[PDB]
Amino acid sequence: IVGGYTCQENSVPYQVSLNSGYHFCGGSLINDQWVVSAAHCYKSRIQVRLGEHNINVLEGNEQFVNAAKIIKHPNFDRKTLNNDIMLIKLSSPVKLNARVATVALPSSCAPAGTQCLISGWGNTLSSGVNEPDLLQCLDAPLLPQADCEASYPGKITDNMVCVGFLEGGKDSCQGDSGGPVVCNGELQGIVKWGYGCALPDNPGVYTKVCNYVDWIQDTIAAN
Amino acid sequence: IVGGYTCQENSVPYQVSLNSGYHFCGGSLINDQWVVSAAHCYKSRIQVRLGEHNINVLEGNEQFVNAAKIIKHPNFDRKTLNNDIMLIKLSSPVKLNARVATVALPSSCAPAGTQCLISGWGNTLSSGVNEPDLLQCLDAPLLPQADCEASYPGKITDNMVCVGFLEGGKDSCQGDSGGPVVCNGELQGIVKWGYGCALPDNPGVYTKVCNYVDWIQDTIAAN
Ligand SMILES: [Ca+2]
Ligand SMILES: [Ca+2]
């Protein structure tokens, strides 16, 4: 997260860190046994870490759980990043509590202008790389599709939404990928991509979760 | 490397990739059994990979060798990055050939204005992250100390040199770290740090190797 602020400890309880011996992507806990992330975050073996604040220090709220089933969207297009959504079934249910909680799926697609919260342990610089210890937070609005398309001529599908600021300075970045965009308590986006990070005229692009509730439900039910 | 070009295959034969299950730093082969890198690249277990071109494809020239002894400069200052130099003794001697060769230590410190070659599999973007497959190369001059100091008020010690362009656009970046700066066939610098990558007025800073030949020799001899 570039230009965000340090979240209050355990204030984003649905936030998870995907680990492979190092943090490489975020995700969201949607039920005691399933995590939603980005298909581009796929790895054959993943340890999901919940209840994290300081990614490098054991603080006593952590739950570490291996992924049992990693299911990328059948239509994920690695090239265009269309359908960049993945489901992780954990090897065992987590203990839900105050620091480890679920986020709701969207009842409807959010209108442009709604204020959302984005979080992650992603890169904090607009240039170069800086990995933070503490979870970062960013308040940012969902932009009109026209602004999104305009910024990325020919690349935005209807499964994508832009969130951020046309002025730059504030945005998600590498390492925030697969992480959540929560608006009015519902998961509306997944950190996907953007050109650079926090650059003027290059808002972040996110997977539009409201287009996948059916799929998410079907999959959970079938697995 | 930001704004560089793809090196001709095996044209930088002293270049090595430091691996921990992924490429994280470069280094230089100074003898059939020793590699020079940056102290900030220290890890307790490292696999040194020589003869690489495409970091993700076995091309048939690779030599993979575990580090036996990793020796950080006794005066490395993690805070200022002063004395950012490390020596890696390989578990066994490599087979020197046309794609796996040594680079000479400096006979003297290079004057500002000399043209050097920097190489690596480091990040290729000025904003965001992009890890390349093929080794990247950059031709760039050593800048006058006055320019260096000016760009980084109070941080440059006499063990540091700036290499690059005050205009930006071209530079080393994260992942090129510990890698070589070769001028007229001698190792004159080690990729150390900079503010961002390829930004105007923020040239890359490198460890000045000509200040350590004694140390390098002593250490090799004593180990
Ligand atoms: Ca922790
Ligand atoms: Ca290779």
UniProtKB/Swiss-Prot annotation, chains A, B:
Ca(2+) binds at E52, N54, V57, E62. Coiled coil: none annotated. The lineage of its organism: Eukaryota, Metazoa, Chordata, Craniata, Vertebrata. Belongs to the peptidase S1 family. Disulfide bonds join C7-C137, C25-C41, C109-C210, C116-C183, C148-C162, C173-C197. Its EC number is 3.4.21.4. Its cofactor is Ca(2+). It holds the Pfam family Trypsin. It comes from the Eukaryota. GO terms for biological process: collagen catabolic process; digestion; proteolysis; response to nutrient. One of its GO terms (cellular component) is extracellular region. This is Anionic trypsin-2. Residues 1-221 form the Peptidase S1 domain. Gene3D superfamilies: Trypsin-like serine proteases (2.40.10.10). One of its GO terms (molecular function) is serine-type endopeptidase activity. The record marks D171 as: Required for specificity. The active site is at H40 (charge relay system), D84 (charge relay system), S177 (charge relay system). Binds 1 Ca(2+) ion per subunit. It catalyses: Preferential cleavage: Arg-|-Xaa, Lys-|-Xaa. It is found in: Secreted, Extracellular space.
